[PDB]
């Protein structure tokens, strides 16, 4: 099976123990069949693909520091990903749709600039993690031209493929969280144009999108205990949609996340950690290592769960508790309510090594191509949790 390891290159410069330098990156490669360098973006002025940190990626060679790892792992394939929900540009918020709707000269400039990034820096191919409009989050028509945009995406993909053919470069698509495949992906047509598709079947709910209630963010199956939950928001619904639309199972990778979605609780959120958790208050305080409100790395979540340091501590120093449905269909929960001396309540939806292993077992049951892991920088690459480095990645590899 494949194990496609995403690498968010912003991790190279993080301040503190979330910093992922190249020796730690290399430790992962014994488990990964592919490494995907994230992320290039689109220029606001002309929609060309470009490095969002040229000083690092180009002038200090981080692109080729990563692609040259093929010298040490000769079968490793290294791709460059465009977009990924990491091209954040509030003053040019329409770039991805404008490229679809673009004049030929604008699209050709994107195709050529992408090609040149792949070739110049030693990549084996390109990942289009296209930043489509997402499902509208439900409180408590996004795109009137979706059908046109589907057709334009097929054509763009066809044109990107053509640019890659003579060199033999790979082309993948990533369907990002809450990107709706019915709206945008002509699945049977895309099958002839791309080598594989990663379905990012996680972050179905997040505190940024869903600040006032919390629910499982990456279940395999639909949780009937999640009152009123939208039925398409689960990994099996997404995978079965791609299979039923005609995509070969061996060309699909199941997306698994190494980070968790963390909500701030209130007293009114009550004492049940099984979701839906009501009356939440947006994102949890950022972790000191990951420094993103509402996200936590696996190491940060592990450090919050019971361990010999914190097991007897009280109030806001007490452990988060594990909530785990015995059927194992839905994923991990780390939880501490607002109660008593505890004033900082938190609910985290995440995969730990065991639930990530179960995602890999589901991939195998459905005869998928493998798993795509988002991303190495939030796996515990230093082994802070148990001493074992990359416990999530290894749990998935073990099962493939």
Ligand X SMILES: *[C@@H]1O[C@H](CO)[C@@H](O[C@@H]2O[C@H](CO)[C@@H](O[C@@H]3O[C@H](CO)[C@@H](O)[C@H](O[C@H]4O[C@H](CO)[C@@H](O)[C@H](O)[C@@H]4O)[C@@H]3O)[C@H](O)[C@H]2NC(C)=O)[C@H](O)[C@H]1NC(C)=O
The nearer residue to ligand X, 222 or 336, going by C-beta atoms, is: 222
The nearer residue to ligand X, 77 or 209, going by C-beta atoms, is: 209
231 binds ligand X per the rule CB under 6 A: yes
241 binds ligand X per the rule CB under 6 A: yes
232 binds ligand X per the rule CB under 6 A: yes
Interface with ligand X (CB under 6 A), residue from 10, 53, 64, 135: 135
CB of 204 vs ligand X, minimal distance in Å: 10
Q: What kind and span of H or E run contains 252?
A: strand 252-257
CB of 100 vs ligand X, minimal distance in Å: 18
CB of 261 vs ligand X, minimal distance in Å: 19
- Alpha carbon dihedral 81, 86, 91, 94, in 10-degree steps, equals 50
The nearer residue to ligand X, 180 or 349, going by C-beta atoms, is: 180
State which residue has the least CB distance to ligand X: 232
Mask of contacts with ligand X, 145-184, x by CB under 6 A?
-----------------------------------xxx--
CB of 374 vs ligand X, minimal distance in Å: 18
CB of 231 vs ligand X, minimal distance in Å: 4
CB of 118 vs ligand X, minimal distance in Å: 29
Q: Count residues near ligand X (CB under 6 A).
A: 9
Say if residues 338 and 265 touch (Cβ distance below 8 Å). Answer: yes
Interface with ligand X (CB under 6 A), residue from 222, 304, 336, 397: 222
The nearer residue to ligand X, 115 or 221, going by C-beta atoms, is: 221
Site residues (vs ligand X, CB under 6 A): 135, 180-182, 222, 224, 231-232, 241
């Amino acid at each position: 099976s494949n194990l496609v390891c995403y690498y968010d290159s912003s991790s190279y410069t993080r301040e503190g123990l979330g910093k992922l330098l190249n020796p730690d990156l290399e430790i992962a490669l014994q488990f990964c069949s592919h490494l995907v360098y994230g992320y290039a973006g689109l220029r606001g002025e002309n929609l060309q693909a470009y490095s969002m940190n040229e000083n690092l990626d180009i002038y200090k060679h981080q692109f080729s520091e990563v692609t040259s790892l093929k010298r040490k792992y000769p079968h490793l394939k290294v791709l460059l990903s465009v977009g990924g929900d990491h091209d954040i540009d509030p003053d040019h918020p329409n770039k991805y749709i404008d490229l679809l709707e673009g004049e030929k000269v604008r699209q050709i400039g994107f195709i050529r600039s992408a090609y040149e990034l792949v070739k110049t820096y030693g990549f084996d191919g390109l990942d289009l993690a296209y930043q489509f409009p997402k499902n509208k989050p439900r409180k408590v028509i996004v795109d009137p031209h979706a059908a046109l945009h589907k057709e334009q995406f097929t054509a763009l993909v066809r044109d990107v493929k053509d640019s890659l053919r003579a060199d033999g470069f790979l082309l993948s698509l990533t369907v990002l969280p809450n990107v709706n495949s019915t709206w945008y992906f002509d699945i049977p047509a895309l099958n002839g144009l791309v080598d594989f598709v990663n379905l990012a079947t996680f972050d179905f709910l997040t505190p940024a999108r869903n600040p006032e209630e919390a629910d499982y963010s990456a279940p395999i199956y639909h949780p009937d205990g999640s009152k009123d939950r939208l039925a398409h928001l689960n990994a099996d619904f997404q995978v079965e949609y791609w299979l039923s639309q005609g995509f070969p199972s061996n060309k699909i990778n199941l997306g698994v996340a190494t980070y968790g979605n963390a909500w701030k609780l209130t007293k009114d959120s009550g004492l049940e950690g099984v979701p839906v958790v009501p009356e939440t208050s947006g994102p949890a305080p950022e972790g000191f290592q990951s420094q993103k409100p509402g996200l936590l790395s696996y190491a940060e979540i592990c450090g919050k769960l019971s361990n010999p340091q914190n097991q007897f501590l009280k109030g806001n120093e007490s452990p988060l508790r594990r909530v785990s449905d015995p059927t194992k269909r839905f994923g991990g929960i780390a939880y501490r309510p607002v109660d008593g001396q505890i004033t900082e309540g938190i609910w985290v939806s995440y995969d730990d090594p065991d639930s990530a292993s179960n995602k890999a077992a589901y991939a195998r049951v459905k005869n998928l191509g493998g798993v795509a892991l988002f991303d190495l920088s939030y796996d515990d690459f230093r082994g802070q949790c148990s001493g074992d480095k990359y416990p999530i990645l290894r749990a998935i590899k073990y099962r493939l």
